[PDB]
């Protein structure tokens, strides 16, 4: 039964790797499409990008503790370590929408250049993936608390372990190709 879905979800994650790859090529070309607008060094508040990363690097260790607790059959600890993970992902999403709001209400929106478009669609897509992961983790804690740690909810914790840790793997390529390699 299980394990076949985890492998299918890993294959979906590979398709997702390629999806994000297409967005890293569109940004690699349109990074200098900054016609009369703001270049990379001008809008990237680098400290604000660091605090995001540490809100997502904690979002992987706090889930790892949830997986360890699930392997220890400690449902209460699973909920406690999943509720804390949803609190760092929520902070990352809050800072992401705050950045996308500081950019839009100052004219530097997605329709200003080819750069900001290639920047709002690459970081914005990662934000959409993270918020989908948050919707998934919230609709999963409802099932862990309701039923328990049944054979169908142990797969969803491991199917989310791949998805949630992978979002922090893409981010290692996001702050180093968009923010670091841009504000350099």
């Amino acid at each position: 039964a299980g394990g076949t879905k985890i492998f299918g979800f890993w294959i979906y994650l590979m398709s997702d790797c390629i999806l994000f790859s297409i967005l890293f090529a569109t940004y690699a070309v349109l990074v200098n499409g900054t016609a009369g607008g703001p270049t990379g060094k001008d809008i990237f508040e680098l400290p604000f990008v660091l605090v995001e990363t540490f809100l997502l690097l904690f979002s992987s260790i706090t889930y790892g503790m949830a997986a360890i607790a699930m392997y220890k059959n400690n449902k209460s600890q699973v909920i406690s370590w999943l509720a804390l993970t949803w609190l760092f992902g929520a902070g990352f999403i809050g800072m992401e929408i705050y950045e996308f709001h500081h950019l839009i209400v100052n004219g530097m929106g997605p329709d200003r250049s080819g750069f900001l478009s290639a920047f709002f669609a690459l970081v914005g897509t990662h934000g959409l993936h993270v918020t989908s992961g948050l919707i998934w983790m919230a609709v999963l804690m409802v099932q862990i608390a309701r039923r328990g740690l049944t054979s169908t909810n142990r797969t969803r914790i491991m199917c989310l372990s791949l998805f949630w840790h992978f979002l922090d793997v893409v981010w290692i390529c996001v702050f180093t190709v968009v923010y670091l390699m841009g504000a350099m």
Binding site: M14, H165, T176
Partner: protein, 99 residues
């Protein structure tokens, strides 16, 4: 399959010495841009590698082997669609200037 509390807290105490060093070099300025770009990219592959090794626990013994195989094949499709597209659109942009 399973990851101990030592698999974590060793990919977490190592991923902070890889999310600070580039975020410090490229921030305060410590070397020539030819070495900064190499550091923030060599440490950007080592961190992804340590994540794949200790967060999405990825051995060769999973799924009869089709767990590292699918990834290694997917990297070959990214390195072909990215390096290919960048090469093409560098040859296309140059050949359409005001020569």
């Amino acid at each position: 399959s399973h990851g101990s509390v030592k698999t974590y807290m060793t990919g977490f105490i190592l991923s902070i010495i890889l999310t600070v060093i580039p975020f410090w070099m490229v921030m305060t300025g410590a070397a020539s841009p030819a070495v900064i770009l190499g550091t923030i990219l060599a440490m950007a592959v080592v961190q992804v590698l340590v994540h794949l090794v200790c967060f999405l626990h990825m051995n060769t013994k999973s799924d009869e082997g089709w767990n590292m195989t699918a990834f290694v094949f997917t990297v070959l499709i990214i390195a072909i669609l990215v390096v290919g597209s960048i090469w093409i659109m560098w040859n296309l942009n140059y050949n359409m200037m005001m020569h």
